[PDB]
Every structure is written in structure tokens, then in C-alpha cells.
């Protein structure tokens, strides 16, 4: 009815301990979602153009041109880590768990409130918020995944991370195909390169509408909604990082001269001269056996062009990389291609009392040492004469194509049948939890955005929209915008997300890295005197595991 | 900022200045988020010699 609630708030996290070291983690989230009525009931096809910015020669990387269908619906997206876990729960998970399985997800909407704003014509303006006991909220669940998948975490548009702060949904839109060509240039390039928006290819047009593709429930103030329980099939994630690179794989060389005194400079010596040694190498014409030349079972990580932009039907896009940079842990200023950089606002981690439009940003320096250090790379001739002469070695200090600032590493690629790499580690709080596998015939090995990728399917996107509340003067043959009573809605969204984890075992003598509250970061996990709150980022793969 | 009249010359605009925007990028040393630099799940197609 009207005065009877249709659900209960719940934001607790439960750890149910099972047999054989497994833990059933139940993350409950509950939010108060506020939704204004849409700008216009009509779907729009909007072409966004930034031809002004790109026209400046050498600025092609800043292309934003595209075409998108903008819809009257709003998306309720909970695909982010911060929605489910507070820093303490994440601390427990990372410090104690070794692997994380995604099990199930269900969500529901209850306690729907619809209100109308009546503004008086009094000389001093005033407005009063009445209820509307008959207005409806349209809720559509795309259980069949008939609509384009649009994860909001990539735009920091998921629900809030604070249970006590109301959150808003995101207006839904999806890309409409377009043809666009942009020939790159540089500062000082003469003339105007070909920079053109070509329209649309009819063979690719796709105009989706929620009304035609999904059943839409109408929820009055006394109604409820529940999506039911979906079950994932994603592969297990590891909360452990690998440190062994190719140089640390296998049996080290026996030391014939061990050190005899403590001290940093009292090194040990192998003894056998490098050309008189034993072992196996992939160098069929060289007698030298060294740690750099000795055969290894396979290659850890791979090299790829960094900051490479490739163009296609829709224009240029950065080539993604599956691993971070090398040595970034020693110097953050060297954090570069491959280390995801998250920007977010006051709903998703930034201090809630901050003023201004500037967002809060952080670069994630993954622990795993699967990355590369392109400055230490080099190529040398097949003859392998040592020391290598100038003409027989290509170095990162060598110009390629006549450019002083570009070297061979910028275009080098070593992905091969021997390559081995790890999945992207979870990013708290702003990291995405799951993502949809592509419908291509050959599917990518991993996604750079989510640790869980969806083999068959995973939960349909949930859409909400304030049903139109017409005035008596409605005339559908009028070309003007529909006349609607100012109406908004507030409804409680509750979700339950179920993981399964294994509790880690101490394999080694020494202790391992752990997350701990300390004097330097103490105040990031408590409110300020004026209620300000922030959710700083936390690393997720502290414990090390042996690669080989 | 949505368009207000029909015709090609009436585009839409994202509004937020590019270096003040929000999102996830694989470019750890720049604040610019554009449709060319924003993170995507994976790569469709590939270049070959």
C-alpha cells in the first residue's frame, strides 16, 4: 500500500567461513537513488564535434568527435568495487585472501517515492513539494542483454560509495555509428590535414529503444522490484602478485666463491669464466653463457608500442597495453603507459568538502613486475661480437625515422607464442568488477578494465525513468516539447554481491606485505569535523606468489 | 549541452573542459581524457606489416 514499506535497508558485509579454507563473502549495498525526470521524452541522435581542438596541428590525440543516441532513461550501475566494500573489508580481503571468485549478484528497488514541485507565482518566489500517489517509475531490466553494454565505472558514473549519502543514476546513451577520418600532423605542419566527419554507414546503423526491447514495469509508491539472482562464470582472480621476471626463472648459477664477511659490497663470484661455462642458450653461434643469454622456459611480459594511436572507421584510439611500466615503484614520476589513471569526483572518493571542478586523480602502480623498462632494451647484430660496435647495435638512444625523440622501442613488439602475462589487478574503490566478453569470433585473452570477464552473460543493465506526468493542455500534434508536471523520484536500491575466496597460507619464513593504518594515512579513513569523507585508493595484490 | 535546432551545424558539446574530465585512462602521466585516450576493454583488430 502507501504506508507499508516494501523492503529493508542493508549495507552489511558478511564473511561466512566454509570448509577447506574457503570464505563466502556477501557484500550488501543499499543506496537512496534520486532521479529527476528526463530533459525530453524523445530519443536524440547527437553528433559531438571538437573539430576546433583537433584543427590545431599536432593535437590529434585530443579527438572527441563521435555520434551517440541520447535516451530519456537513466542507468543504475553498481559495477564498481567502492559500492560494495569499505576500506576495512577490503583490508581483510587483501591481507587474508589469495584468490577471489565472483559467484552471484542480485538487486532490487523498494520504497519508491514520487514527488511534484509546485512553484507559486508569489512576487517572492516559493516552491512546495507535494506527493503524487499515482505517478509511476518505469523500471526496465535488460535480462536478455539486448542493449549496448555501457559500464559506468569508465566514466566514474556508478552509484556512490558512501552508504549515508544519496546517489544519482547516470543518463543513458550509446554510440551511434559514424565515419570519421583524421590524418595526423604536428606543430609546424603546413596546411590543414584531412580532418573530416563522413556521416554514417547505413549498413551499421543501429537504433535501440528500451520500450521495444525490454519489458517495462511501472512502480507506484507501494510497488517493489527485484531482478532475481544471476550467477557468474568468470575465471578466478588472484590476490597475489608475481615478481620473477625472466632473469629469476630456474636454477641460479653455482657460486664457486662465496663471500666471507658481512657487508653490502662483499659480493660472491661465480668463478668459471663466462665462455667456459655450462648450460643451454638459444645462441647457436656464441660460446658465452651469462644470466642475460641463458635459456629460460618462456618470456614473462611483452613489449608493445607505447603511446601508439591506431585509426579505423571511427578515428584514432590509443593502443592498450596489458602491463605497467618498469621501475615505477622507485620513481612515481616515471609512471607511464600501462598504468591506469583514474579520475573521479566527490561521489566516488574525492573529499566531499572540496570545491571546484577539478577532479581527484591517481595513477595505479601495479605491484606485479610484468612490465618492461624500454630504456634498458637493445638490439644487436646476429654475429654477437663483444664489445658491440656502434654499427652493430640499435639502442633506445638511436633515432628512428630521423626523429630524435622517437626510438625503436616506441614501435617494438615482442608478443609471441612464448609470452606469459597476468590479469589486471582490482582497483579499489573505482575499479570495475565485471565486464562483458566481446561477441567477436576470436575473443581477447584479457580485459584491461575488469578482473572478471563474462563468458556467457552477466546481469542486464537496470534502467529507471520518471513516467511523464502530463498537463491538461497536452496536444500530441504540437511540435513543441511536451508539457509535463515537474516530477522527481527517490527510491532505495539494494544489491547483494556474492564472492568466494581462499584464505592465504604462509609459505615462507619472512612476513609479507600488508595494508595497515599508520600515522601518515590515518585521517583518510575517518570523517573530518565538517563531515567530509574520502576513499583513497588501495592496492590489491600485496602477497607474492612464485611464478615458476 | 545538447543541440537546440535541426541541421548538421547544430552539434552537441560535452561541456567539461578536457583536462578537468573524469574517467579511466591507460595514460598514467596525463590528465587529458578524450575518446581517443579513454580506456577501452580491449582492442578490436590489429595492425600487421
Amino acid at each position, epitope marked *: 500500500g502507501v504506508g507499508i514499506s516494501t523492503g529493508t535497508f542493508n549495507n552489511q558485509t558478511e564473511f561466512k567461513f566454509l570448509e577447506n579454507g574457503w570464505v563466502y563473502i556477501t557484500a550488501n549495498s543499499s543506496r537512496l537513488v534520486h532521479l529527476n525526470m528526463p530533459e525530453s521524452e524523445n530519443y536524440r541522435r547527437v553528433v559531438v564535434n571538437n573539430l576546433d581542438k583537433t*584543427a590545431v596541428n599536432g593535437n590529434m590525440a585530443l579527438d572527441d568527435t563521435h555520434a551517440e543516441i541520447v535516451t530519456p532513461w537513466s542507468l543504475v550501475d553498481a559495477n564498481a568495487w567502492g559500492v560494495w566494500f569499505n576500506p576495512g573489508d577490503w583490508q581483510l580481503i587483501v591481507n587474508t585472501m589469495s584468490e577471489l571468485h565472483l559467484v552471484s549478484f542480485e538487486q532490487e528497488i523498494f520504497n519508491v517515492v514520487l514527488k511534484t514541485v509546485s512553484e507559486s507565482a508569489t512576487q517572492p518566489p516559493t516552491k512546495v513539494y507535494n506527493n503524487d500517489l499515482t505517478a509511476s517509475l518505469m523500471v526496465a531490466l535488460d535480462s536478455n542483454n539486448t542493449m549496448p553494454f555501457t559500464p559506468a565505472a569508465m566514466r566514474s558514473e556508478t552509484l556512490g560509495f558512501y552508504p549515508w549519502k544519496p546517489t544519482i543514476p547516470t543518463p543513458w546513451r550509446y554510440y551511434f555509428q559514424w565515419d570519421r577520418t583524421l590524418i595526423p600532423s604536428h606543430t609546424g605542419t603546413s596546411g590543414t590535414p*584531412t580532418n*573530416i*566527419y563522413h556521416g554514417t554507414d547505413p549498413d551499421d546503423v543501429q537504433f535501440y529503444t528500451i520500450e521495444n526491447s525490454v519489458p517495462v514495469h511501472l512502480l507506484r509508491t507501494g510497488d517493489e522490484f527485484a531482478t532475481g539472482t544471476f550467477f557468474f562464470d568468470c575465471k578466478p582472480c588472484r590476490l597475489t602478485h608475481t615478481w620473477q621476471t625472466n632473469r629469476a626463472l630456474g636454477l641460479p648459477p653455482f657460486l664457486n666463491s662465496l663471500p666471507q664477511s658481512e657487508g653490502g659490497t662483499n659480493f660472491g663470484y661465480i668463478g668459471v669464466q663466462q665462455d667456459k661455462r655450462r648450460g643451454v642458450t638459444q645462441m647457436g653461434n656464441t660460446n658465452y653463457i651469462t644470466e642475460a643469454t641463458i635459456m629460460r622456459p618462456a618470456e614473462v611480459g611483452y613489449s608493445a608500442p607505447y603511446y601508439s594511436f591506431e585509426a579505423s572507421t571511427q578515428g584514432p584510439f590509443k593502443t592498450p597495453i596489458a602491463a605497467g611500466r618498469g621501475g615505477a615503484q622507485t620513481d612515481e614520476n616515471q609512471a607511464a603507459d600501462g598504468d591506469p589513471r583514474y579520475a573521479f569526483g566527490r561521489q566516488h572518493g574525492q573529499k566531499t568538502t572540496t570545491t571546484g571542478e577539478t577532479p581527484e586523480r591517481f595513477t595505479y602502480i601495479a605491484h606485479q613486475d610484468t612490465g618492461r623498462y624500454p630504456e634498458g632494451d637493445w638490439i644487436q647484430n646476429i654475429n654477437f661480437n663483444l664489445p658491440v660496435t656502434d654499427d652493430n647495435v640499435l639502442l633506445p638512444t638511436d633515432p628512428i625515422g630521423g626523429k630524435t625523440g622517437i626510438n625503436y622501442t616506441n614501435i617494438f613488439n615482442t608478443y609471441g607464442p612464448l609470452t606469459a602475462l597476468n590479469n589486471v589487478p582490482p582497483v579499489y574503490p573505482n575499479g570495475q568488477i565485471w565486464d562483458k566478453e566481446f561477441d567477436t569470433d576470436l575473443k581477447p585473452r584479457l580485459h584491461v578494465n575488469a578482473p572478471f570477464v563474462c563468458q556467457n552473460n552477466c546481469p542486464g543493465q537496470l534502467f529507471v525513468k520518471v513516467a511523464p506526468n502530463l498537463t491538461n493542455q497536452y496536444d500530441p500534434d504540437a511540435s513543441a516539447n511536451m508539457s509535463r508536471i515537474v516530477t522527481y523520484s527517490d527510491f532505495w536500491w539494494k544489491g547483494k554481491l556474492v564472492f568466494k575466496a581462499k584464505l592465504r597460507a604462509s609459505h615462507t619464513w619472512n612476513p609479507i606485505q600488508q595494508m595497515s593504518i599508520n600515522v601518515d594515512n590515518q585521517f583518510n579513513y575517518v570523517p573530518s569535523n565538517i563531515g567530509g569523507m574520502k576513499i583513497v585508493y588501495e592496492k590489491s595484490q600485496l602477497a607474492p606468489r612464485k611464478l615458476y | 549541452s545538447l543541440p537546440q535546432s535541426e541541421g548538421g551545424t547544430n552539434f552537441g558539446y560535452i561541456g567539461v573542459q578536457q583536462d578537468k574530465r573524469r574517467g579511466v585512462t591507460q595514460m598514467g602521466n596525463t590528465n587529458y581524457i578524450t575518446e581517443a585516450t579513454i580506456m577501452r576493454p580491449a582492442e578490436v583488430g590489429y595492425s600487421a606489416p
Partner: antibody
Amino acid sequence: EGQLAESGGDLVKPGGSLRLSCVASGSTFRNSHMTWVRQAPGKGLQWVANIDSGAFTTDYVDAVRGRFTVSRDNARNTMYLQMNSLRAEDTAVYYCATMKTSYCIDENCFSFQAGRGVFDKWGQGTLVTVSS
Amino acid sequence: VLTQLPSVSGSLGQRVTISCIGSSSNVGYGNYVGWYQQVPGTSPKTLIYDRFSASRSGSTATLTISGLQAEDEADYYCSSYDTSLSGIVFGGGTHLTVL
């Protein structure tokens, strides 16, 4: 629709400095390439300078190179022209205008391409003179 | 500086052409061309971004005006972008006398 509005033009002593302003109305200023042009009385239209939307690059004519400095403020939604080292030749009416960055191919504009050399909208203008 | 005619004249209701005869790497090259109208004391108005028409016409652009009236008895300017200067350039302007 919104329009531009110039201000700051006036007689000033030769060799001095001044600062012309061009207020912009409408949401397109942040997105538009801005330009300054000047017209000496009964003379031909003379380009002064241009600056892109993001203040990434600036261009001037040799006649004002090293003397004029164009700048913009999206927070104030305005453009400015610092006319340092004023010279007798600066006496003219100065306008601020918008350079058309996109030109549509089809007459209904289903396809667009970048270009330069056409000014879309013009401001009111301000008169500047250089004399003692 | 682009070469533009000093002036042209014609009676009411007739058709006239005002030509811009700049060189290559300039208005007479793949770059765009723009025409503006102005009466002394008024800001120029951009004609071609309805009775008017225009054509780059290879190395020499032309604006075909028609329906000459008391209004439009004004000055007309040609503009383009020059690569040798890498900047916007203008023609000398042309005046129209309507008889």
C-alpha cells in the same frame, strides 16, 4: 543569440600600452577559435591575431609580432588583446570575431571537414587611436 | 595581400560578380574562401558560410550577387588562409555602386 562585445578602445599616447577586451555571450566561446581583426579608416580589413579554443597556439601578423599579445579566459568567458608598444599604425577599429573551424560538405551538412580562413560571427568593435 | 577589384556598379535587380584573384598556396588553392559585406561604420556580415552565390573557380574565386537594391550598395571583402604566411589574409576590398 549571443554576440560579442569589444571594449577598451581609445586614443592613447604613442609608445604606451593598452588592453582591449572582447566579452563573449553564448556557450560556443569556450569551443571557438577567436580572432582579432583591425580596419584602418577607409582601408582594407587587416588580420591581427588568432588563438585556438584551448589556448594551445597563438598566431599574429608580422605588423603586430612581438607587440600584441592575445589571450583568453574561459572562466571569465572573455578574450583580451594586450597592445604593448603602441605605434602610429595601430590607429583603427578593432573587431573580435569567430573563425569557422568546421565546414559542412553536403548542403544539409551530413558531413563536415576542418578548414580555416572564414570568420563566422563578428563583434561590435572599438576605436583605437595613437597620438599625443 | 590578395588582389581584389576596386569597385563595380550595376542597376537595380541585375546580376554582378565580384572576383578574388589571389595566387596559389592561397585563395587560389585548396583552402576555403570567405566573403563579407560592410557599410562604413558597420561590422562585416558573413554572406556565404540567399540570392547570393559563390564559387572558388580554381585559382580565382567569385561571388555572384543578384537582386541589387539600395541596401547592399556597400563594400565587399574577400578573405582566405595563406600557407606562405600560415595566417589569415584579406583582399583589398571592393565597393558596389547600385544605380
